[PDB]
Chloride pumping rhodopsin
Amino acid sequence: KNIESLFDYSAGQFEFIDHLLTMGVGVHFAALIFFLVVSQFVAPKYRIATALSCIVMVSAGLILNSQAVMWTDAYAYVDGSYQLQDLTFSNGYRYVNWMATIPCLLLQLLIVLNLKGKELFSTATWLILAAWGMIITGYVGQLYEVDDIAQLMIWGAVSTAFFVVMNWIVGTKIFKNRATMLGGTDSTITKVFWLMMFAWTLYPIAYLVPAFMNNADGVVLRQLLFTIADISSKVIYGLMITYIAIQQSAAAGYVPAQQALGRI
Ligand SMILES: *C\C=C(C)/C=C/C=C(C)/C=C/C1=C(C)CCCC1(C)C
Ligand SMILES: CCCCCCCC/C=C\CCCCCCCC(=O)O
Ligand SMILES: CCCCCCCC/C=C\CCCCCCCC(=O)O
Ligand SMILES: [Cl-]
Ligand SMILES: [Cl-]
């Protein structure tokens, strides 16, 4: 049902995809350890943001590693190419884990924006509904990514609509809660917002790929468009969100955040 099943792969194509995915496990897991060690310098009020990023890292990784084992499971070198065998490869769990990588993500954004209580719960609720709603509409079209391209174009459209609409919630909360933010990070939070738009349009670029490049190199470009997406929405919003918590902790008088910044 997915263009990946349609082709045989050069050895260079199959190896590049497999190193891509593996570089992936490597980075989500190495960043996994950074995210743990530095959590002891984040003040109690922000320390979950730090934590939330370990879930991101270990969702991702576990499922990224899943994809690379399935890639080698699915294909075997036969008469001069990698041909599809008895098991299949697909990108379902990405998505299926898109569906949960994000709650925790906008959650640790919302933490460092200093929201608390009811605005925090309420904002997170609407956000999860609409991201989730981007995530799932987009899931029903890549399902048609071979059979019915106008169903890619139509589900695409609707997911996008959901994407447009959700960057408004986040936009608004950021520009409205900038002023709350400590130790200089009111400037910083505007970068993460932008940082954040780039990686997430990579994925619609990553979706119209059957529509505009249905061949084996397109399969490759998807996955490339996949590994970067991931170093940014997961690994580098990751970090950037983390700096903000530590800086705000120092600004609010938390001595291990103060000493941590001082050391460097
Ligand atoms: C791993 C983390 C994140 C934040 C992934 C977010 C995904 C998007 C912004 C994807 C959007 C889609 C749309 C807008 C277009 C058609 C179908 C998609 C699911 C690829
Ligand atoms: C075997 C997997 C292939 C890649 C090996 C990965 C291990 C080294 C990767 C680089 C570290 C990831 C980025 C930096 C971690 C955050 C710590 C920091 O920025 O101070
Ligand atoms: C911003 C995220 C950083 C992601 C780094 C991903 C690294 C990709 C590395 C360089 C691409 C060079 C590709 C050469 C591939 C040719 C493929 C082929 O064999 O046909
Ligand atoms: Cl605190
Ligand atoms: Cl994922």
Remarks:
- Residues 216-251 form the longest helix (36 residues).
- Residues 1-264 form one domain.
- The chain is about 75% helix and 5% strand.
- Residues 43-45 surround chloride ion (ligand 4) (CB under 6 Å).
